[PDB]
Design a protein around this ligand. Structure first.
Ligand SMILES: [Mg+2]
Length: 580
DNA sequence: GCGATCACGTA
DNA sequence: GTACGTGATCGCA
């Protein structure tokens, strides 16, 4: 039951057809500067396994890889493209990416290797990567006979699966989403990852030294306030100190024991001086271990850059995620953490960081999709949307909006976006369920088109079994019919939230493609470095800043046409922190 | 070493 | 209540 293929000693012309399934295998999780362990080609003329030392030194093979008119079908072509970039080799002509095709057809499947995608079309003549390479410490590259068969089977699967996947994308009206949005974006993300972001490691180390002294001070304050030493990092040990020794009231339970979440601790602060010190310890220790030590661990000493990996085929909404490091959760809310961003610097002297962010893109998308007259008019007037929402639900003039009224309207606006619920709003504003219900009802009285949209999209999700975004991304919601209230209610909130969050994701991806094209047309040296969901981060020569100030907001604002304007804020400076 | 759990940072 | 990734602990081998 094995496959017939050539174990090739040299590259022949028949391996260089103008259409082929191509496998450029990178087994290490983090593919930056990682080994390519083997290569398989399936085309009209046969099935071929090439050792990479042979293939990647062959001028004809490298020219074929780089020829845009030689079309390749692959799985996770960004992984191969980036690993080849580190070897100075350009991958072009990737016309079909099976990982992205499977992701668009059903993000919930968790498709992470060829075998999982193949199973979607009843094709099982390929093993899961985990069965071949192993898991964790057992992970290893097998001997060439076993490796070569696996790589040819993956290429053979890709060769056979392109047509049924493209046929279903076509029936879904998602063919352009793959070919004009996700596949071009993959090349852009590959360039961004390869370029990396320069880190000022000396400044991080100096911050780490300052945190370690502060942490030493707080931890001794906690040990004297507790009258005892314990592992403050251990939620169990801390729970014994607070709730058994010090007898603090138990306000929240976790499945395992006592909650020690920052939410609970804030409420316990009036009872004992220790609680404020634990919160302070938690803040500082999060910065030190996750953002100082964690960041320093993944800076490449050869470049002094971090080279993130964007996962383009993971989230259920169409957002990107970012790993090793995750550069989409660098602190910004609190000032002490915000100073971490001073460590992210331009990669050349006399360059600057330029950052541009959409203003309230998710509420603007909702205004467009719901066609809510009041919400649309608020954005057409470029109002402060949280102040305007407070005015409406409290029925007060703008000068009667107090800071706390705006804070509660902002929390409603966040809930509306995320799938509004009695319980989650109540928990967030620390109010009762009945009170949160009244807030939501007053919101829907002020925004009746938003109410109609929320009712209609839930009905559409039940009828069709999925919801869609502006650019035809879809998310299936089988739990929408569950008779379990909690399971059904989460699916209803996803029906509400996904067209909003997913459409905002669609727009920023289109902005990234349009921006990359405009930068090349303008012959700017400016480079995209990062996307953080509603924001784009670039670096550029300081002599390009004035041009970027006009170009980048205009490209982002024109990425799609909605019934309301899109608004982009932007800043630049010497570090990511100063791009504020 | 592995996985369940808790906590917390972003959007 | 959205969507994630990471670090630490802990009890299991
Ligand atoms: Mg913003």
């Amino acid at each position: 039951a094995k496959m017939a293929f050539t174990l090739a000693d040299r590259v022949t012309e028949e391996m260089l057809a103008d259409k082929a399934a191509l496998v450029v295998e990178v087994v290490e999780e983090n593919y930056h500067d990682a080994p390519i362990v083997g290569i398989a080609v399936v085309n009209e003329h046969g099935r071929f396994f090439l050792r990479p030392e042979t293939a990647l030194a062959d001028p004809q093979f490298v020219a074929w890889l780089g020829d845009e008119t030689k079309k390749k079908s692959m799985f996770d072509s960004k992984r191969a493209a980036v690993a080849l970039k580190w070897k100075g080799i350009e991958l072009c002509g990737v016309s079909f990416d099976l990982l992205l095709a499977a992701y668009l057809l059903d993000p919930a499947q968790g498709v992470d290797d060829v075998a999982a995608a193949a199973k979607m079309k009843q094709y099982e003549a390929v093993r899961p990567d985990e069965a071949v390479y192993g898991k964790g410490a057992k992970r290893a590259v097998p001997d060439e006979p076993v490796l070569a068969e696996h790589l040819v089977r993956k290429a053979a699967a890709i060769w056979a699966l392109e047509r049924p996947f493209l046929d279903e994308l076509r029936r879904n009206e998602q063919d352009r989403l793959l070919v004009e949005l996700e596949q071009p974006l993959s090349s852009i993300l590959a360039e961004m990852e390869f370029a990396g972001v320069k880190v000022d490691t000396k400044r991080l180390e100096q911050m780490g030294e300052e945190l370690a002294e502060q942490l030493r001070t707080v931890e001794q304050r906690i040990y004297e306030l507790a009258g005892q030493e314990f592992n403050i990092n251990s939620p169990k040990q801390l729970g014994v100190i607070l709730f058994e020794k010090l007898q603090l009231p138990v306000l929240k339970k976790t499945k395992t024991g006592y909650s020690t979440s920052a939410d609970v601790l804030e409420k316990l602060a009036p009872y004992h001086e220790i609680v404020e010190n634990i919160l302070h310890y938690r803040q500082l220790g999060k910065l030190q271990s996750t953002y100082i030590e964690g960041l320093l661990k993944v800076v490449r000493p050869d470049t002094k850059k971090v080279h993130t990996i964007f996962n383009q085929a993971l989230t259920q909404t169409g957002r990107l995620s970012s790993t090793e490091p995750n550069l989409q959760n660098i602190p910004i809310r609190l000032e002490e953490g915000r100073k971490i961003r001073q460590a992210f610097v331009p990669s050349e002297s006399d360059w600057l960081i330029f950052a541009a962010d959409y203003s309230q893109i998710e509420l603007r998308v909702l205004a467009h999709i719901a066609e809510d007259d009041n919400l649309m008019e608020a954005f057409r007037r470029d109002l402060d949307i949280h102040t305007k929402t407070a005015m409406d639900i409290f029925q007060v003039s703008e000068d009667e909006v107090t800071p706390n009224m705006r804070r509660q309207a902002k929390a409603v606006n966040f809930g509306i976006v995320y799938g509004i619920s009695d319980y989650g709003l109540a928990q967030n504003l620390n109010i009762s369920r009945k009170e949160a219900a009244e807030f939501i009802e007053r919101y829907f009285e002020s925004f009746p088109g938003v109410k109609r949209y929320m009712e209609n999209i839930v009905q559409e999700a039940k009828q069709k079994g999925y919801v869609t975004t502006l650019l035809h991304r879809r998310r299936y919601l089988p739990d929408i019919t569950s008779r379990n209230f909690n399971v059904r209610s989460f699916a209803e909130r996803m029906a509400m939230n996904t067209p909003i969050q997913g459409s905002a994701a669609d727009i920023i991806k289109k902005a990234m493609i349009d921006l990359n094209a405009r930068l090349k047309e303008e012959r700017l040296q400016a480079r995209l470095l990062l996307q953080v969901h509603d924001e784009l981060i670039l670096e550029a020569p300081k002599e390009e800043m004035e041009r970027l100030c006009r170009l980048v907001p205009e490209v982002m604002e024109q990425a799609v046409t909605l019934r309301v304007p899109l608004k982009v804020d932007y800043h630049y400076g010497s570090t990511w922190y100063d791009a504020k």
